[PDB]
Design a protein around this ligand. Structure first.
Ligand SMILES: Nc1ncnc2c1ncn2[C@@H]1O[C@H](COP(=O)(O)OP(=O)(O)OP(=O)(O)O)[C@@H](O)[C@H]1O
Ligand SMILES: Nc1ncnc2c1ncn2[C@@H]1O[C@H](COP(=O)(O)OP(=O)(O)OP(=O)(O)O)[C@@H](O)[C@H]1O
Ligand SMILES: Nc1ncnc2c1ncn2[C@@H]1O[C@H](COP(=O)(O)OP(=O)(O)OP(=O)(O)O)[C@@H](O)[C@H]1O
Lengths: 709, 197, 70
């Protein structure tokens, strides 16, 4: 049978003679049918074995329809009714070159091939089809083995799913990477390994991977590529193949294996045991040939590369990281011109630098190039959305709104996102938290100090903020942090909550595990979710050798392995420990005894329950000794500030009066010895609230009123 | 051995267990192969299974039986319940010299059950080769992989490689890791060579 | 001093360090404890010496790459 691809033309050639309803099928017909248009999508134009063999079809595009319009017109049924064995031989005559060029069926060349006599301009000036001269010539150029089956695609499956940068690179489409140079170099090195050509990326994507692969191919097109693979080039797959599929995917593989290291493929995350398939090219890469390039993320890697280990033996992973904050500045400087000229605008460095500078911090997820630029275009958008919408004079993007607004366009509290020198939070936080919490100047000092140390990087950049805090319940410990992060992270929720009393034995499981049940996670599940965080650990003497040991890393390095195994940075985060041990020994501050004394009195107790090294891990440890009823009542209006916060504000507009009496009554009844003022909240929750709450609809209070009990 | 022709190569993979089979395959064309073993040659099935697609692997048992033990088979780390069980009905026909191999792992699993299919199998465990082993292959393959990479090396390095390599190798079979580090060393500065300075 | 310079003067700041036995006796004397040795002094230095700079860092009256002993 004829090749479908051939027959696709052939019937379309029968269709060709049908459209003008030709009387007969005659040599010069399909010269039009071979060609939809001059596109190499019609190979008989340029990619034809003749244009390369003998007769170029460019102007020779001219004459084909000239005949088929000058054929004597016919009617529908006699159209394509005849093979007209003069042409009808081409049916058989196409089987002649399948001999000398070694083919079986009758292909696009063959249907073409047979035509080489009269299908033409045959004259004194003959623009025609040379007989053996173009094809056997270029039927090796084309192909070199053509024959497979009537079925199949064009008779170059490459350009289907092979998308090449070097094209775009020599085109200059893509954006030059920054700083991945040695990373490129590293890979390229690996790319020079006969054992593992395969470099492999791990990390979080959006990170420059195929751009790395650009710099890769960039080094090809500028011949920064060293000798071996200079002749080689780049490809990268399209998953776009969508009959069955992998078989197709197999096609190029042979082809590229035939292609003889003049190109290289690039795949990104998708390296797959297919669910319902198997290993394709996994053998053909196991074929010990065919330079290829890998990448993925962690457990994906864990999954596939280990379940073989010859993937391991084929793949050498080189894991890039989210770059040092300053890098993207360059790629920003790279893309500064870009999107502003996309968005018809300008950029100030002030925001430009700032973008990452913050989005590093307060953006949870994305990548130094990514996350920043994400802001940018979006920042770029609104300002242009303003400009290209009406309130322009802004063209450059200046820090504040372009950042903080746009930042707060994620979050809020921009003025903080605006103001902080990141140092200033040091200097004034004491008084700041002093406004939040009274006394415990130690905590005021040390925690600040410690965190004043936690940044400025005086010690290991990987190293946590290690806090065991003590006192009574209701002592503002939780608040402290909640303030701290609230101060620091502009939020409380960085706080993360594990009572050490929760789980006695296996919690190591319940934080994380290589999961069999499968736990999505716990700790990191929050913290890997929340990279800037605070860690509350509670009754740590009831933290068990289960957990307190993995505290060691948790006390180390501020970077924590996962159950899936990944290490997760806590050095950006805080950790908080508490105990009831010397809450007795707080009976010292009952007599207001020397705390350092009773510290020692307490210190042993925790020192008893734990390992000094585990303790020497701690930046510092502090007790809350109970503090003045002054301090107690000093809480109150403050405790009431957080009352009125919304209340007189976003609804009531309720002016507020207070009887020192009740305030004292509160100051009397608000503080509990054991419980601190933790009642006071719930206290105020009642009489203050409800009498207020009651009078509300009772309308003696209206807006702007003030009545205390 | 007429009694147990089938070996079981035991050991952790990456050690050269089919590099064994390499020179073995060579001894076939080197013609040191014993009279018992002369007429046979090397087949080694690297199993790609891709209606049952396996019975192919079973149908070939006749194709070698066609040749009538005119070859040998070698399977490397795949020794497991197949379809059903791997191999034997041709071997269990009494026929079919095969080169068996495994880690103790796959040795710990199915062949623990019967043990009388290992009735064909002497289990031989490879040990991570000595320094000269690495050295000598390096000695042989230093010029190889420097010409594979089109470069040159100091044999001074070459032996010195194995030294710390063997010393501080946390994991692998040294020559690999060596050849790795070698190729690493090779390609690394070769890539540094082929790419300007 | 090593584990000081390892970070400031090495892996981050490139900030020089100087001391005197004046301050070091103002340390080691207190810095040494009988049973635990100077293991106290390590976690001692952690602020009043360290954070004295973490103070001075943004207090900045004198800057990085300098050194001033107390
Ligand atoms: N060095 C870089 N040069 C150019 N673009 C970069 C670079 N680093 C990151 N990018 C940008 O961030 C993304 C990273 O692209 P690339 O694929 O190369 O890395 P990636 O991690 O694979 O991104 P993706 O996750 O979509 O695969 C792209 O949007 C790219 O424009
Ligand atoms: N010095 C203080 N300054 C401000 N608020 C304080 C102070 N001491 C205690 N509080 C208040 O005490 C309450 C509870 O404090 P604390 O952190 O001790 O509770 P906790 O840590 O959650 O354990 P629990 O709440 O059960 O006592 C909060 O309302 C907090 O504001
Ligand atoms: N002594 C040697 N001489 C030459 N090449 C060797 C030698 N040992 C190992 N090799 C090389 O090691 C590679 C393959 O090693 P080989 O597969 O034999 O290790 P392996 O332990 O058998 O792994 P597996 O157990 O899965 O079969 C080849 O490139 C081969 O040339």
């Amino acid at each position: 049978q004829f090749t479908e691809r051939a027959l696709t033309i052939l019937t379309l050639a029968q269709k060709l003679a049908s459209d003008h309803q030709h009387p007969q099928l005659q040599p010069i017909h399909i010269l039009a049918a071979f060609i939809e248009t001059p596109e190499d999508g019609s190979v008989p134009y340029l990619q034809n074995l003749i244009e390369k063999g003998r007769y170029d079809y460019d102007l020779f595009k001219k004459v084909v329809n000239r005949n088929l319009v000058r054929i004597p017109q016919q009617q529908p049924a006699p159209a394509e009714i005849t093979p007209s064995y003069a042409l009808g031989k081409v049916l058989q005559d196409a089987a002649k070159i399948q001999k000398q060029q070694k083919d079986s069926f009758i292909a696009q060349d063959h249907i073409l091939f047979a035509l080489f006599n009269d299908s033409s301009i045959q004259q004194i000036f003959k623009e025609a089809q040379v007989d053996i001269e173009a094809i056997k010539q270029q039927a090796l150029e084309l192909r070199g083995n053509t024959r497979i089956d009537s079925r199949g695609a064009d008779t170059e499956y490459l350009s289907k799913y092979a998308i090449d940068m070097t094209e775009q690179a020599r085109q200059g489409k893509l954006d030059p990477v920054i700083g991945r140079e040695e990373e490129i170099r590293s890979t390229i090195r690996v790319l020079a390994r006969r054992i593992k050509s395969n470099p492999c990326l791990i990390g979080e994507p959006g990170i420059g991977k195929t751009a790395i692969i650009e710099g890769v191919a960039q080094r090809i097109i500028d011949d920064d590529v060293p000798t071996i693979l200079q002749g080689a080039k780049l490809f990268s797959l399209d998953l776009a193949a969508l009959g069955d599929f992998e078989e197709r995917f197999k096609g190029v593989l042979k082809e590229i294996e035939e292609s003889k290291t003049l190109i290289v493929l690039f795949i990104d995350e998708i390296h797959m045991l297919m669910g319902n398939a198997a290993n394709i090219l996994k053998p053909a890469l196991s074929r010990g040939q065919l330079k290829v390039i890998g990448a993925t993320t962690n457990n994906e890697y864990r999954s596939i590369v280990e379940k073989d280990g010859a993937f391991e033996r084929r793949f050498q992973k080189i894991e890039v990281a989210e770059p040092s904050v300053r890098q993207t500045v360059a790629i920003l400087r790279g893309l500064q011109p870009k999107y502003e000229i996309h968005h018809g605008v300008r950029i100030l460095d002030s925001a430009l630098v700032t973008a990452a500078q913050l989005a590093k911090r307060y953006l949870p997820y994305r990548r130094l190039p990514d996350s920043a630029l994400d802001l940018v275009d979006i920042s770029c958008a609104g300002v242009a959305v303003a400009r290209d919408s009406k309130p322009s004079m802004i063209q450059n993007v200046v820090d504040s709104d372009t950042i903080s607004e746009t930042a707060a366009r994620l979050t809020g509290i921009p003025v903080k996102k605006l103001s902080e020198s990141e140092n200033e939070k040091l200097i004034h936080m004491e008084r700041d938290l002093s406004s939040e919490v009274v006394g415990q100047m130690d905590a005021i000092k040390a925690v600040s100090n410690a965190v004043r140390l936690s940044r400025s990087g005086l010690a290991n950049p990987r190293q946590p903020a290690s806090f065991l805090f003590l006192g009574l319940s209701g002592s503002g410990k939780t608040e402290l942090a909640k303030k701290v992060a609230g101060f620091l992270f502009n939020d409380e929720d960085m706080m993360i909550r594990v009572d050490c009393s929760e789980l006695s034995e296996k919690y190591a499981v319940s934080k994380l595990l290589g999961t069999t049940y499968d736990e999505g996670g716990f700790l990191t599940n929050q913290l890997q979710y929340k990279p800037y965080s605070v860690l509350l650990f509670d009754e740590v003497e009831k933290a068990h050798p289960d957990v307190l040991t993995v505290m060691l890393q948790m006390l180390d390095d501020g970077r924590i392995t996962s159950g899936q195994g990944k290490t997760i940075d806590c050095s950006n985060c805080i950790v908080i420990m508490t105990s009831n041990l010397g809450a007795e020994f707080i009976n010292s501050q009952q007599g207001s005894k020397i705390q350092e004394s009773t510290k020692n009195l307490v210190m042993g107790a925790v020192r008893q329950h734990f390992r000094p090294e585990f303790l020497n891990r701690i930046s510092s440890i502090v007790i809350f000794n109970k503090l003045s009823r002054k301090a107690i009542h000093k809480i109150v209006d403050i405790r009431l500030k957080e009352i009125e916060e919304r209340f007189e504000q976003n609804d009531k507009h309720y002016k507020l009066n207070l009887t020192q009496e009740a305030k004292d009554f509160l100051a009397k009844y608000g503080y509990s010895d054991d419980m601190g003022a933790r009642p006071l909240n719930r206290l105020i929750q009642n009489e203050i609230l409800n009498k207020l709450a009651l009078r509300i609809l009772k309308n003696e209070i209206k807006d702007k009123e003030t009545v205390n009990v």
